[PDB]
Every structure is written in structure tokens, then in C-alpha cells.
Design a binder for this molecule. Sequence first.
Ligand SMILES: O=C1CCCC(=O)C1=C(O)c1ccc(C(F)(F)F)cc1[N+](=O)[O-]
Ligand SMILES: O=C1CCCC(=O)C1=C(O)c1ccc(C(F)(F)F)cc1[N+](=O)[O-]
Ligand SMILES: [Co+2]
Ligand SMILES: [Co+2]
Lengths: 374, 372
Amino acid sequence: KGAKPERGRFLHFHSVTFWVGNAKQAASFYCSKMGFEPLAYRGLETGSREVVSHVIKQGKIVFVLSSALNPWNKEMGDHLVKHGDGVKDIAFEVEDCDYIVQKARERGAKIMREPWVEQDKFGKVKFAVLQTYGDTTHTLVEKMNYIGQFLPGYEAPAFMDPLLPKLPKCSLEMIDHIVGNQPDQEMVSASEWYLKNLQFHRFWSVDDTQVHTEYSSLRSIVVANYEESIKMPINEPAPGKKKSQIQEYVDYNGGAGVQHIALKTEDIITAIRHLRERGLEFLSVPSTYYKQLREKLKTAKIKVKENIDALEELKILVDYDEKGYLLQIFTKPVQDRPTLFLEVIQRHNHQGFGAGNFNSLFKAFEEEQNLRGN
Amino acid sequence: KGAKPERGRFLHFHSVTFWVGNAKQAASFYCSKMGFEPLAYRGLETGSREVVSHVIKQGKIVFVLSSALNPWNKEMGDHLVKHGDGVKDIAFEVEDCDYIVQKARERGAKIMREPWVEQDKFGKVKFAVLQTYGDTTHTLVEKMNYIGQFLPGYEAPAFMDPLLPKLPKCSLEMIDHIVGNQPDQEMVSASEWYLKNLQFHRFWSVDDTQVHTEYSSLRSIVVANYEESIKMPINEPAPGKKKSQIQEYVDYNGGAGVQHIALKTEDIITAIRHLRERGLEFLSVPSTYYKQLREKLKTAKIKVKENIDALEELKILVDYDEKGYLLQIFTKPVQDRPTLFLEVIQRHNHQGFGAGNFNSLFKAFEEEQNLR
Ligand SMILES: O=C1CCCC(=O)C1=C(O)c1ccc(C(F)(F)F)cc1[N+](=O)[O-]
Ligand SMILES: O=C1CCCC(=O)C1=C(O)c1ccc(C(F)(F)F)cc1[N+](=O)[O-]
Ligand SMILES: [Co+2]
Ligand SMILES: [Co+2]
């Protein structure tokens, strides 16, 4: 949706690396309650004596849970005391890594790790780490004739949970978008980091055409690579009807970081029905939200293929324009700090993110409080 | 048995408080994989703005998973960088909290928190915190006409996991014992801390009537309150045929701490089948252990009521003497660091702790090696 970069390409999201206090229990949690399955493992049993990593997978989504094996680890320890459990690195699978790293250096980005190559019998892979907002980093993955299962240096998982095969499939397929919350007046600079250093462009959608700040208490700029396969909204607090939840994140995260990861699915009724069966908790939606959605769809230009009675019981939200609609629902925070959560989304010819639900939910709670009093 | 202390009494284990990086997911793990159920909760929704605690319960066992809510917490943060996830506090429900604290301070104990009282709609409870080995502490709880579900300041859990009722129950009843590993030459001071300051006594068992050091690589002093409802073995590394795992625990924990918690069941066959169905992992036991077990039982004075074929499939261990036997099995470490693990035990007139299995497993692993 802009100009074309001469060299390099960002294929898609490769993986999301979490830095958690207990990688064993973290990988167990995401497998039990979000439909992930063990893929690879790195730890003491494999020769990695300082850092353990549990690799889990569902569809094309790859999560990495990592913890420190020895005491007095400063880098991982400070990150855990500062943020708690949260996202550390967002990986991009790229083509022509050497130009992307050097052109990013020419534009003034901090190269945290110079390009290096790891190898096993299955091929070679090139990596490189750049620093973005807060302590969040971006690792670049370039497969150079690599054929293995995941990456070199990871063996078969340490343990295969026999409970996972008996649990219903959640049908989560790929990562749609990853939102990074920024502190005050840092949305523009953080969004410029990708346009400047990685030659991204601002992704425009129907959300950019409404003033939702009075109901959202946030400002948002969506940034995307050239092919628009990687989309990452960048948020910052804004004044609004209520105190900004972007500020609540920054206060509890200790700075900038990933607010939520969005996972795209093609069957959100099956996905949410099975995720709730596995025990995952989602946001509360009042009954008046679906009382109002039925009246809206009588005058809307589109028809929803999904059953409205099913959406009401599963507490799934809907946002539409004149040409399509999307279905979305958000989990409760996956930790105790009101920081990181996750989102399940299904798209029906709609490139938005649900900004219309800030006004929709405000009207839904408005009738509910109007009922309890008037 | 002994001479009853003048005043005061230690009723039983109250609870075990963990200091973990994610109290939400930690409480989910013990509920999903060990048969616990949400009991009470403390957090931002309840007014507790600095420490979040998910309280879970199974039988009489009560675990408390706690984390820090605000960034840059020094004490909980340093404990997390040093130990990782592990036990922080072992609580005792006591009678006459004020004298137990007064006698402990008089005998030289470090009182971390003086006796204080909290009160809600269900009654009053008195607390006191003592420091024991390493960074582990001991909270004394005294119920003074409290009738509520747990303790004041805790309300109904934030979320009732809808998957838990669909999972089979694990039939774990109570905490049998809690073991604390000490470095070399600190077993005596740590174990004597309880006899001196709390008027505990040394608990002796059939394990103590033999020397198992060449196969266990550890020394142990088991401490118990007067009523012997609270048992806490205190370990230290000792030279032996293999690398001391009591030493490897201290190396990865940064000092003394709780090595494992033991949970008692009255049906270990059902417990282990359901724990394995829920996804809990246990230690590997070679098949030659059960070939040798059936040969030992042809001569033993006792008869094991449980199916030997079931013990072999579930990888449960057996230790017996001339008057009874116990069944036990150990989980893999509940973290990636080889520090804390857990044990499930069923007792059939046997007051030991399984010291004979070090020798039994060593001979079993040796026969597997020569037959490969
Ligand atoms: O996808 C992001 C893009 C930036 C703004 C942010 O609000 C979007 C979230 O997905 C989103 C969308 C809607 C809602 C609502 F209104 F339904 F609550 C909430 C969020 N959210 O969790 O930030
Ligand atoms: O319960 C403790 C008491 C102190 C000594 C210790 O060995 C006891 C453990 O339960 C125990 C018993 C047996 C084994 C064996 F030999 F099977 F590995 C291991 C442990 N243990 O993990 O401490
Ligand atoms: Co989103
Ligand atoms: Co034991």
C-alpha cells in the first residue's frame, strides 16, 4: 500500500518467545488451555545448560517458553522482576537477512546481535536480533536450505503430555496481529521505528476513519510490512471517558511491551466452544450487547453467517462495515498483572481490528446500568 | 511419644505457600495436573494491590501460589531470580500462638513478624512468622472462632476452571511430610532449630536402623511436633556411589530449601492412574525393579495387598520391613531446574520414608545396564 523496497522480504511471523518464570508450567498452560502441542525442546538433556526452552505449536503459530536454569541470571531475572511473564521477542522469517540487518543499521537501529549461523544435519539457518520498544526484541530467521522440524539445536520434546490428545482441537491457525503498547507520546516514535528501520508502511483500515478515543482511551497506528503479511498495531494512552488501559499496562509492565497476540481462525464457534471446554477464561459481555446487535443487523448491509444465539452464549464480539465483518473475543489476562492477554479473531472480508466495539460495549453497559436503576 | 510441652500445641499442616513467577498459571498447573480445586483468592479485585495469591485445596492439602503484582519487587524478585518457583512458607495451625512465639524468641528464634490479628465477617485468626532454614519461613495460624472457608481477606476464587470437574479425582488426602535440603554440616543446626525453638522431637523410624548413605548420598534427621502430625525430614549431602542429588539441589536453589512435598493417599493405584491421565509426569523405574520385587516378596514377612502388576504399570515403588510396607512414587521436577518435586505415598503400617529404595533402585539400574 506504499512504495517497494529493493531488497529483502519479511515472509511472515516465525515465532513468539516468552520469558517466563517456569517454562515447564507455562508450556503446559498454553498446551492445556489454548490447544498447543509440544514441538521441540532445548535444555539440560540437550546440552543447553543455562537456558531451557519449550517449543509448542498449533497450526503455524509457534510459542517459545524460556526460563533461566542457573541462579543469578541478571538479564532474564531483571526481565522477570520488571515485567513478570510476558513476550520477549517477536520473530520474523525473512529473505535476504544481510541487507535487512545492514539497512536497519544505516537507519540507526541498535543491532543487539550481529548475524550468526547455526547448523545441524538438516541445514543452516541465519539469525539476527534487533531491539525495538522496551525490552522487546525482533529476531530474524533466514532458512538457508534448512529442512528440519523447527530450528537447529532443538531436539524432540522432553515430555509428551498424554492429556493433550484427548482434548478438543481449538482450530487456531496463524498469528493475525501483535499489539505493542507504548507509554505516553511514544506511539509515533515506535511506529516510525518500523517504517524507518525495516521499511514498513502504515496499514490503513476502516478503524483509522473513526474517533473512538472517547470510548477507547487509546491512540493506534497499525504498521505492516510491504506484502502486509505482518501487521502490528502500536498503541499509546489517550484521554477518554475512562482512564486508559494502555496506561494500566505500562504501569504494570514497567514500560513498553506486547499487549496481546491475535490468532486467526476459520471456525470461531468451534474454537471458542473448545477453548472454554479446556478451561480458558474470556472477557465478560453483558446481555445488552446482543440485544443491541440484533437490532443493528436488521438495518445493516451485511448478513452474519454465524448463529447469533451461539455468539451470545460464547460471548464473542462482532464489528462490521459496509463490505464485511469480523468476529473477535479476548481472553482474560494470562497472568495476574493486567498486562498480556490474547485474542481470537475470524475475518469475513474485513481488515479492521474491532474499534467499533469500544462504542458498542459502551452502549451495551449503558443500557445495563440504565436497567438496574431506571 | 515423649514429654508433652507445657503450653501450646501444633495441630497439623495448615498450608504451603509458593513464591512463583505466575501465580495464575501455577495454580492452574496444580489444579489441572494434581487434582486440586480453587478455594480462595487474593488480588487486585479483592483490594490486595501488592501481592496476588491463588489458594487451592485438595482434601486437607492447601497450596498457596503467590506472585508480585508491581514491578521491581525486591524481596519476591530476588527470591525468584535466586530460586525460581519454589516453596516460600510452611504454615502450621497452632493452639496458643502467643506462647509458641514467646518461647521461640526466648530460645533464640528469629521472629519475622510479631503476632497480629486479622478479622472479617467469619471470625478472627492470629498469625506470626518465623524464619527457618534458608529463605523458608514458618507462619503460625491460630483460629479463634473462625468459621469461614479459609482465612480473612480471601473471597471466592476469581475463576472456577470448567475443565476440572471433567477430570478424574486423585484421592490425595493430607500432607504426609515436607523435606528441606541443607548444605553440608547444616543438617544438625536446621533440625535442632525445631527441637530447640518449637519443642519438637527427633522422629526415628525403621529407616534409621540401617546405613543407606552409600546409595542415598544423604543424611536425614526427621523432625516432628509432639503429636507427630507434622513431620519434616532435614537432609544434607553425604558421600555415596553417585552424585549427591541433595548437593545438586543446593547448587540449583542457591542454598537450603524445600526439596519435595509428600501427599498421603488411601488408594495410590487410583491416585496414580488419574494423575497420569491428567498429564503429570513421574520418574522412570526400570522393569528389573519389579522382577526383583516379586522375588523379594517370595520371602518377605508381609503380604502386599495391592496388585503387583498395577504397581509395575504405574511405576510405583515399594519399601517394606518385617511388620508392614509403604507405597511411594515421585514426580519429575515441577520446574526445569532440578529443585522441587513431589511425592505420593500410601502407608500400610509403616512409618518409614522409603530409604531402602536407593539400594533397590541401584541394583535394578545395574541389572538393566548389564543386560543391554
Ligand atoms: O487489535 C487492536 C488494534 C489497536 C487497538 C486495540 O483496541 C485493538 C484490540 O484488538 C481491541 C479491539 C476491540 C476491543 C473492544 F472494544 F472490544 F474491547 C478491545 C481490544 N483490545 O483488547 O485492545
Ligand atoms: O521422604 C524422604 C525422607 C528423607 C530421605 C528421603 O530419601 C525420603 C524421600 O521420600 C525419598 C525416598 C526414596 C527415594 C528413592 F530411593 F526411591 F529414590 C527418594 C526419596 N527422595 O526423592 O528424597
Ligand atoms: Co487485536
Ligand atoms: Co519423602
